[PDB]
Design a protein around this ligand. Sequence first.
Ligand SMILES: [Mg+2]
Ligand SMILES: [Mg+2]
Ligand SMILES: [Mg+2]
Ligand SMILES: [Zn+2]
Lengths: 30, 148, 115, 81, 156, 17, 86, 139
Amino acid sequence: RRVMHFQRQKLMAVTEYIPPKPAIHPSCLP
Amino acid sequence: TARGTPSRFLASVLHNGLGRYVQQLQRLSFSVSRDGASSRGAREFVEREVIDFARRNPGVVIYVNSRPCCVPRVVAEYLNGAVREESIHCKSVEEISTLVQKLADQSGLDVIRIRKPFHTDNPSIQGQWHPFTNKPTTFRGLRPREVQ
Amino acid sequence: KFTRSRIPEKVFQASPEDHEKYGGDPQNPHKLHIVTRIKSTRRRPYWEKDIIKMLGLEKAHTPQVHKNIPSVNAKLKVVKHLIRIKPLKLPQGLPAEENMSNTCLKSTGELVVQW
Amino acid sequence: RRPRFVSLRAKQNMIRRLEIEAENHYWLSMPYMTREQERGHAAVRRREAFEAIKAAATSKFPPHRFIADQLDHLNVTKKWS
Amino acid sequence: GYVPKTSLSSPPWPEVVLPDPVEETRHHAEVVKKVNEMIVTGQYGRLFAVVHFASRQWKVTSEDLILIGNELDLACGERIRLEKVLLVGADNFTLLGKPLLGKDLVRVEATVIEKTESWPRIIMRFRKRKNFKKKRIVTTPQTVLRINSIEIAPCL
Amino acid sequence: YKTKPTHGIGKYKHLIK
Amino acid sequence: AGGQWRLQQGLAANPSGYGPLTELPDWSYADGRPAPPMKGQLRRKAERETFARRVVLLSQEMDAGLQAWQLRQQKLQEEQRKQENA
Amino acid sequence: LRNRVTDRYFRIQEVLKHARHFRGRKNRCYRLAVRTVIRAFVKCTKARYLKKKNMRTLWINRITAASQEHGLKYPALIGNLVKCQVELNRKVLADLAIYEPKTFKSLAALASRRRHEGFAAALGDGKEPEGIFSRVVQY
RNA sequence: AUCUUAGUUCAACUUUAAAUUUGCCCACAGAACCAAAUCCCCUUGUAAAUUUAACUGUUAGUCCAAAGAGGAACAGCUCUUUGGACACUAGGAAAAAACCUUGUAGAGAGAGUAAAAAAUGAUCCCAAACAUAUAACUGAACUCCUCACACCCAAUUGGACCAAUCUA
Ligand SMILES: [Mg+2]
Ligand SMILES: [Mg+2]
Ligand SMILES: [Mg+2]
Ligand SMILES: [Zn+2]
């Protein structure tokens, strides 16, 4: 689990998965 | 270096440009040897450049003499008492003309570090800042945590 | 090892979604590219230092014009990450032999006459 | 220690550069000509420019010399009288 | 929509709603006329201006001096006018350009009182262990502009 | 060559059982 | 420092770029006659002039190349008709 | 002895004259005066960059103080004076804050006005008429 | 290559002067049977390259990304290869040759930017603090601005000046 070069770190951070927000919260609506 | 050198503030002689501009240089002495090799540029300047300079600056009295006998020099005297010598030995006529114009184009103050580039005698119009500008006042002039 | 990069052509294919996102058009493309350098040649391989020295992009931002022909694009596809390319716009036409000395390039990329 | 903690400012800087280069991608997928159309249209200018380089390179030679310059050096003893 | 009062429903800043422009234009015209009538009658004192020059923004007023580090190819004592006034102010009013004020509204006069060469400055480079040591002396020229008058005119 | 469409034209080993 | 806003409004990012501040004459004479222009303005006029000349030259060359291609297509597509007779 | 330097004195005094104001033996002993004088001139050269940086940070501090006197941070003042197309720099802003308080009061009012206009515009739906101060003037 | 690896000679690289005309980049085509890329040229962007005359100097360097061989796939390990940087300027990551940003040099009490902030065992802890006022601002010797310009590498090489002494 070695460390990464810093620029590879930034590339991994910027390209991180962002999930699609659900239209409504399930708790307060089916 | 700054710390290792004098300094002054930006100034003029007698509020020069306020009423009427006056030219500070008032006397210019040329010593030119009639024979020396170092006095060649000086001889050219006197022979074909000093008359025109005299005409262009009628407030400057230009004396020229031929008794250093080996080395030339120009001594510029100003209204405010300052003297300033410059070597013209082994220099060209272009250099001497540029130098003499430089002498005639400056006030006789000292060429030292000007602390400020702007000198104003009335720096404020609306009243210089003090800690009570932009600060309110309260009823009867009470300090905080008073009673009466 | 580290080697030159051959960019697949698939990337250089404007889509119907890209076209309305920048002020362009598939048909009737644009004559000239205005290109500026926004990154240092230092810390990059020599086959980019030389390209930049060839496109006249030595100085920093300092925009410079080039043809939009594939012989130059092949060079700009190597230095595409050290430059900004915008398309020159001429909404008043090429200047005449008069108005050459009274032109101006606005930040939007339009060349105009008499400011 | 050795690992770092990529900030948000760095992410925003990187996204700025990514967007600029995506625009660059776009402005290179539409050339005015094709490979075959362009061929030769600059030949005349290139030939003339290289001929200018050649004529510059093949002109080196010592400068002239004038008698006036040599005799002017006698001025270093010019005197009044 | 409606949301019962809490600590986060509304933000912690006030809802500042601007005046209706129809009346605001009248108000602006009224105050502009007031300032204009101040200017016409001489209802001001000493003036100050933010003049843009060689590359710098000098805050200046009548009778003061300024020192520009570049020769200005002007004889000694030749009056000149300084365009590019960014802001001119009196005790009670001040006028702000966007970004300059018109050539008619403000007139700044200056005079050339002295041209000289600044005090000698040193440029020394040194690097350790590489025998790299070099020294240069530079005297940038400069000129002193006196400012003779800031006059204003009632063109608003 | 290997990066050309003509690659693998000289093969004959697979033509021998 | 609003370079983002200035470029979003068709202005130069740097107020010392192109604008009334940098290119209008910094001074005139007292009487009213204008002043000999500043060196920076001369140099910027020269560089913008060279930019325009390069623009027109490259555009002309590209158009002439297109016309030359048209001519060659004509003289190779039609001169084959001269072999379609007799 | 055919040639001997007859004027080493002046070459020494050229370097000592710049060290008379030093402290220690290194204001009269050449072997030390030279090294410290050279360091002095190198710092003298390299210090102009810091002079500019420091005066600018002083101006930013003074402007932050003045602008906070009027309930307005420094990001707002500069980032919303330019949106009103006023190219006043920071030296003159500091000078105004110190020496012309009411002019600076007006500038702060203008900045707050433009800030409010921006907030109101962005809060709205579409391109409703622009603010009375938010209208750009083209060249 | 060397009784040679503490050095020398040749080459490669560097410098000066001189001659001439192509040099670099580069698509399409092309390079075997038994993955990155490489080679080669029409154009195109460029202005350099080859050749001749004449000398010195460096030579088996460190770190980082990558692909391999040796020691685990580790031992901060020996070696080969492609690239970058250092031994040159400057700003950042705390201090910081080797990471990120940046080069051609001067004056300015002007301006715009680049990179750049953390999330959830043994002398003595170690910046201080802060949960919620609109996102912009700050930030270089990079760039623009007014003026001036030969005026920030080791070894080496070219050039312009010159202190003091003697002689004509
Ligand atoms: Mg700065
Ligand atoms: Mg070829
Ligand atoms: Mg520079
Ligand atoms: Zn719920």
